[PDB]
């Protein structure tokens, strides 16, 4: 059984060690036309390995022994009532136990507390696993930026944008 | 007729007073599918009227023969992805269609090359067909959008379209 709280300074090491790295046999391929964009899930072989290089809050999911099993960092922009999920990670050995949903429910709580109109996140097109998890939690594609990762370690990837009403 | 320079503190009043408002007979309509987005230019009738609500930031001003600010562009460089963002570009009504827009974008391109940018990038509302057509002519293409960006704003019902070009 897992419990939730606001992250504390002593959690910083455990949070950094839940690093987000993953292997995927699928990516969301972006086809650019002059008049629009198509997202299509596509097989890759060999599997792709991805390693990552007041209105803010970080929540931590905690096991019975007090160990951080996941976290979410969120930020509110009053201008458009957007709660951004800046990061959400569940430790690999603690997946499929509802922690992801629980951290997103804490994000939804902060949203309602601030009077947000929608949840929003950025996810790289190669992160098919996270995209599938977000789809199941009720997020849909609201856009993308094919240029965001130009001149970065992630060049060749596209930033996909997902939202849901609060 | 028009010259360009870096904005000075005394220009702030003239820049704020420049009216970016426009009338359009067309909008770029955004169709959302589960698997993508289509942009299609479409007629609106009657015409839509739209009113708008440190070393790596710069504002340029276009100046008429009498020294009056006729247009401006605010730009910002992010070294992380080598992006020069055109944050704002506005030409005063009655100085439009005289090459000021191109001239301000050329100054943006100069700042890009000075900072070693890889691309120019801008946000434009889907209803701003005139600016979109001008950006297409200057060499920009659609690199994305955010259909949720204007939720809870005066612009709700519009979509943010994203355009880029290599430097
Ligand atoms: C982009 C903008 C600044 C251009 O203003 P401008 O000074 O009249 O533009 P220029 O005269 O430099 O023209 C630039 C190019 O775009 C073209 N262009 C401008 N409007 C066009 C239109 N509606 N259809 C087709 N081409 C168009 C020009 O003909 C020119 O191409 P050319 O060199 O082949 O002739 C325009 O958006 C504007 O009038 N500003 C109003 C404010 C605004 O739209 N704000 C931006 C949203 S934040
Ligand atoms: N859920 C967040 C997320 O996906 N993070 C990305 C993630 O860390 C890496 O992306 C891949 N593809 O690995 C990384 C590329 O090296 O880009 C991150 N995205 C960013 N960082 C930018 C700056 O904070 C400011 N301006 C932006 O617009 C932000 N966008
Ligand atoms: N060329 C710039 C531009 O298009 N400006 C828009 C413009 O001023 C209005 O939009 C329409 N459609 O009128 C306005 C809402 O009404 O939103 C602006 N866009 C923004 N402002 C946000 C903040 O700066 C911080 N974070 C963002 O992500 C920015 N996005």
Residue numbers in the entry:
A (entry chain A): 8 to 60, 73 to 185
B (entry chain B): 8 to 60, 72 to 185
Quoted from the paper:
X-ray crystallography was used to investigate this complex enzymatic process, which showed Orf1 has two substrate-binding sites that sit 13.5 Å apart unlike canonical FAD-dependent oxidoreductases. One site could accommodate glycine and the other glycinothricin or glycylthricin. The resultant product is no longer sensitive to aminoglycoside-modifying enzymes, a strategy that antibiotic-producing species employ to counter drug resistance in competing species.
We then determined the structures of SttE in complex with ST-F or glycylthricin with CoA, of which crystals were packed in space group P1 and P212121 and determined at resolutions of 2.42 and 2.36 Å, respectively. The structure of SttE revealed a single core domain of a general control non-derepressible 5 (GCN5)-related N-acetyltransferase (GNAT) architecture, which is composed of seven extended β-strands and three α-helices. The AcCoA donor sits astride the fork with the acyl head facing the sidechain of the glycylthricin acceptor. In brief, residues D63, E141 interact with the guanidino group of streptolidine lactam by three H-bonds, while residues S176 and E176 associate the carbamoylated D-gulosamine with two H-bonds. D106 appears to be the base deprotonating the β-amine group for the acetylation modification to take place, while it is a bit far away from the terminal amine group of 4.
